[PDB]
Amino acid sequence: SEVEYRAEVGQNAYLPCFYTPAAPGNLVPVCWGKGACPVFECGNVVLRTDERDVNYWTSRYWLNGDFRKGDVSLTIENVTLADSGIYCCRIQIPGIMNDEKFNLKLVIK
Ligand SMILES: Cc1nc2c3cc(-c4ccncc4C)c(Cl)cc3[nH]c(=O)n2n1
Numbered sequence: 001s002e003v004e005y006r007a008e009v010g011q012n013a014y015l016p017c018f019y020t021p022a023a024p025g026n027l028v029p030v031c032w033g034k035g036a037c038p039v040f041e042c043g044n045v046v047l048r049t050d051e052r053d054v055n056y057w058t059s060r061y062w063l064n065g066d067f068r069k070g071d072v073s074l075t076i077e078n079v080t081l082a083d084s085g086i087y088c089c090r091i092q093i094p095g096i097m098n099d100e101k102f103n104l105k106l107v108i109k
């Protein structure tokens with residue numbers, strides 16, 4: 001088939017996303033959203049970070065990894081079938097036409 005991430009209703013879903021900062025504590029803002037990265041900025045936004053901290057989140061969506069070291073992987077808690085679909089993790093590297101865009105397909109059953 002093709003790369004996908006899987007969960008059963010009631011479980012947590014785990015969607016990977018990583019970048020390497022230039023030096024520790026020098027973070028890059030990240031945009032997580034539902035929908036593919038060609039849509040707006042990172043789809044329908046569910047979570048954002050900036051250079052210093054998490055600045056936006058939606059209930060059930062988490063960065064539980066070490067995001068100050070570039071692990072910006074997403075946890076979606078207590079998934080339902082409506083959570084299936086493509087998600088966008090966008091690494092907003094400073095500068096123009098240089099973002100890293102990751103599209104992650106989540107399948108719930
Ligand atoms: C009461 C509550 N708080 C959060 C929350 C907090 C954070 C967060 C903020 C700053 N530093 C580390 C973290 C993990 C994130 Cl990323 C996601 C979150 N999502 C969520 O459903 N809730 N709910």
Ligand SMILES: [Ca+2]
Pocket residue numbers: 092093094095096097098099
């Ligand atoms: Ca950029």
